[PDB]
Design a protein around this motif. Structure first.
Motif, PDB file in Angstrom:
ATOM      1  N   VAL A  15       0.830  -1.199   0.000  1.00 58.76           N
ATOM      2  CA  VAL A  15       0.000   0.000   0.000  1.00 58.76           C
ATOM      3  C   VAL A  15       0.868   1.254   0.000  1.00 58.76           C
ATOM      4  N   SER A  16       1.933   1.258   0.801  1.00 60.08           N
ATOM      5  CA  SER A  16       2.828   2.410   0.821  1.00 60.08           C
ATOM      6  C   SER A  16       3.501   2.632  -0.528  1.00 60.08           C
ATOM      7  N   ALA A  17       3.762   1.558  -1.280  1.00 60.64           N
ATOM      8  CA  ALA A  17       4.434   1.708  -2.565  1.00 60.64           C
ATOM      9  C   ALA A  17       3.610   2.514  -3.556  1.00 60.64           C
ATOM     10  N   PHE A  18       2.306   2.654  -3.322  1.00 64.16           N
ATOM     11  CA  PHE A  18       1.421   3.370  -4.230  1.00 64.16           C
ATOM     12  C   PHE A  18       0.727   4.537  -3.551  1.00 64.16           C
ATOM     13  N   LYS A  19       1.405   5.150  -2.578  1.00 65.87           N
ATOM     14  CA  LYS A  19       0.832   6.293  -1.875  1.00 65.87           C
ATOM     15  C   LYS A  19       0.645   7.497  -2.793  1.00 65.87           C
ATOM     16  N   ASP A  20       1.466   7.628  -3.826  1.00 68.51           N
ATOM     17  CA  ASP A  20       1.370   8.782  -4.709  1.00 68.51           C
ATOM     18  C   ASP A  20       0.148   8.665  -5.608  1.00 68.51           C
ATOM     19  N   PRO A  21      -0.758   9.645  -5.594  1.00 71.79           N
ATOM     20  CA  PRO A  21      -1.919   9.599  -6.487  1.00 71.79           C
ATOM     21  C   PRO A  21      -1.498   9.466  -7.940  1.00 71.79           C
ATOM     22  N   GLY A  22      -2.225   8.629  -8.671  1.00 70.54           N
ATOM     23  CA  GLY A  22      -1.992   8.446 -10.085  1.00 70.54           C
ATOM     24  C   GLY A  22      -1.006   7.359 -10.445  1.00 70.54           C
ATOM     25  N   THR A  23      -0.373   6.719  -9.466  1.00 69.27           N
ATOM     26  CA  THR A  23       0.702   5.774  -9.739  1.00 69.27           C
ATOM     27  C   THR A  23       0.293   4.313  -9.604  1.00 69.27           C
ATOM     28  N   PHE A  24      -0.977   4.016  -9.337  1.00 70.01           N
ATOM     29  CA  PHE A  24      -1.333   2.630  -9.050  1.00 70.01           C
ATOM     30  C   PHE A  24      -1.067   1.729 -10.253  1.00 70.01           C
ATOM     31  N   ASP A  25      -0.458   0.576  -9.987  1.00 72.56           N
ATOM     32  CA  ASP A  25      -0.290  -0.487 -10.975  1.00 72.56           C
ATOM     33  C   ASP A  25      -0.643  -1.786 -10.272  1.00 72.56           C
ATOM     34  N   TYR A  26      -1.763  -2.394 -10.658  1.00 70.32           N
ATOM     35  CA  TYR A  26      -2.206  -3.591  -9.942  1.00 70.32           C
ATOM     36  C   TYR A  26      -1.207  -4.737 -10.062  1.00 70.32           C
ATOM     37  N   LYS A  27      -0.443  -4.797 -11.149  1.00 72.80           N
ATOM     38  CA  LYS A  27       0.441  -5.945 -11.337  1.00 72.80           C
ATOM     39  C   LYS A  27       1.576  -5.939 -10.323  1.00 72.80           C
ATOM     40  N   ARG A  28       2.256  -4.800 -10.190  1.00 72.52           N
ATOM     41  CA  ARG A  28       3.271  -4.666  -9.159  1.00 72.52           C
ATOM     42  C   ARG A  28       2.655  -4.735  -7.763  1.00 72.52           C
ATOM     43  N   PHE A  29       1.454  -4.174  -7.579  1.00 72.04           N
ATOM     44  CA  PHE A  29       0.802  -4.255  -6.273  1.00 72.04           C
ATOM     45  C   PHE A  29       0.533  -5.707  -5.883  1.00 72.04           C
ATOM     46  N   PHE A  30       0.033  -6.514  -6.827  1.00 75.33           N
ATOM     47  CA  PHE A  30      -0.235  -7.918  -6.528  1.00 75.33           C
ATOM     48  C   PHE A  30       1.039  -8.687  -6.195  1.00 75.33           C
ATOM     49  N   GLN A  31       2.169  -8.321  -6.805  1.00 77.68           N
ATOM     50  CA  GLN A  31       3.438  -8.948  -6.439  1.00 77.68           C
ATOM     51  C   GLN A  31       3.849  -8.544  -5.030  1.00 77.68           C
ATOM     52  N   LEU A  32       3.852  -7.238  -4.757  1.00 76.84           N
ATOM     53  CA  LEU A  32       4.348  -6.744  -3.472  1.00 76.84           C
ATOM     54  C   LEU A  32       3.485  -7.223  -2.314  1.00 76.84           C
ATOM     55  N   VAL A  33       2.169  -7.302  -2.525  1.00 78.33           N
ATOM     56  CA  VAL A  33       1.237  -7.678  -1.462  1.00 78.33           C
ATOM     57  C   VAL A  33       1.192  -9.180  -1.253  1.00 78.33           C
ATOM     58  N   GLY A  34       1.842  -9.955  -2.126  1.00 80.99           N
ATOM     59  CA  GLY A  34       1.876 -11.395  -1.973  1.00 80.99           C
ATOM     60  C   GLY A  34       0.642 -12.111  -2.463  1.00 80.99           C
ATOM     61  N   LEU A  35      -0.145 -11.471  -3.329  1.00 78.78           N
ATOM     62  CA  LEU A  35      -1.325 -12.111  -3.897  1.00 78.78           C
ATOM     63  C   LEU A  35      -0.975 -12.974  -5.105  1.00 78.78           C
ATOM     64  N   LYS A  36       0.008 -12.564  -5.899  1.00 78.18           N
ATOM     65  CA  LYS A  36       0.523 -13.461  -6.920  1.00 78.18           C
ATOM     66  C   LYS A  36       1.045 -14.723  -6.251  1.00 78.18           C
ATOM     67  N   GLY A  37       0.641 -15.877  -6.785  1.00 75.76           N
ATOM     68  CA  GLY A  37       1.000 -17.158  -6.211  1.00 75.76           C
ATOM     69  C   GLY A  37      -0.013 -17.733  -5.247  1.00 75.76           C
ATOM     70  N   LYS A  38      -1.165 -17.093  -5.082  1.00 83.89           N
ATOM     71  CA  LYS A  38      -2.192 -17.615  -4.204  1.00 83.89           C
ATOM     72  C   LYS A  38      -3.119 -18.550  -4.967  1.00 83.89           C
ATOM     73  N   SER A  39      -3.585 -19.578  -4.267  1.00 88.69           N
ATOM     74  CA  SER A  39      -4.541 -20.518  -4.821  1.00 88.69           C
ATOM     75  C   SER A  39      -5.873 -19.836  -5.115  1.00 88.69           C
ATOM     76  N   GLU A  40      -6.667 -20.493  -5.968  1.00 89.62           N
ATOM     77  CA  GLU A  40      -7.981 -19.961  -6.325  1.00 89.62           C
ATOM     78  C   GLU A  40      -8.836 -19.726  -5.089  1.00 89.62           C
ATOM     79  N   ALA A  41      -8.760 -20.623  -4.103  1.00 88.10           N
ATOM     80  CA  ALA A  41      -9.571 -20.457  -2.902  1.00 88.10           C
ATOM     81  C   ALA A  41      -9.162 -19.220  -2.109  1.00 88.10           C
ATOM     82  N   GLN A  42      -7.862 -18.940  -2.020  1.00 90.37           N
ATOM     83  CA  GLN A  42      -7.434 -17.754  -1.287  1.00 90.37           C
ATOM     84  C   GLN A  42      -7.739 -16.489  -2.077  1.00 90.37           C
ATOM     85  N   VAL A  43      -7.611 -16.548  -3.399  1.00 93.07           N
ATOM     86  CA  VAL A  43      -7.993 -15.410  -4.233  1.00 93.07           C
ATOM     87  C   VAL A  43      -9.469 -15.089  -4.053  1.00 93.07           C
TER      88      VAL A  43
END
Ligand SMILES: [Ca+2]
Ligand SMILES: [Ca+2]
Length: 109
Positions: A15-43
């Protein structure tokens, strides 16, 4: 809360990595937050938190509040960021994100 499936420290870093308005990128956010690599049930647990009104879909205004679903003090996205996020996952063009669409966003990130 979102900590049922993701780590508190990863949430704070992502969340801190995207504090600047206008900079959100879900792909990098999903990597940093640890959502990439989650099973379908956890997603599915993540999807259900983001689907605040239990409709079965993440509507556009729920996408605008995506960061708040991970951390209560996160900022809202701008309309520009929200439209880009919606366009990245709304493969049937109905204006909202369904469960399979969301799982594909995690997979393609
Ligand atoms: Ca909803
Ligand atoms: Ca859709």
């Amino acid at each position: 809360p979102m900590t049922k499936v993701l780590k508190a420290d990863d949430i704070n870093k992502a969340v801190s990595a995207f504090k600047d308005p206008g900079t959100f990128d879900y792909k990098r956010f999903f990597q940093l937050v640890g959502l990439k690599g989650k099973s379908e049930a956890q997603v599915k647990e993540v999807f259900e938190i983001l689907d605040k009104d239990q409709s079965g879909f993440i509507e556009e205004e729920e996408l605008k509040s995506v960061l708040k679903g991970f951390s209560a003090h996160g900022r809202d996205l701008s309309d520009t960021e929200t439209k880009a996020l919606l366009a990245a996952g709304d493969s049937d063009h109905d204006g909202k994100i369904g469960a399979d669409e969301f799982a594909k966003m995690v997979a393609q990130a």
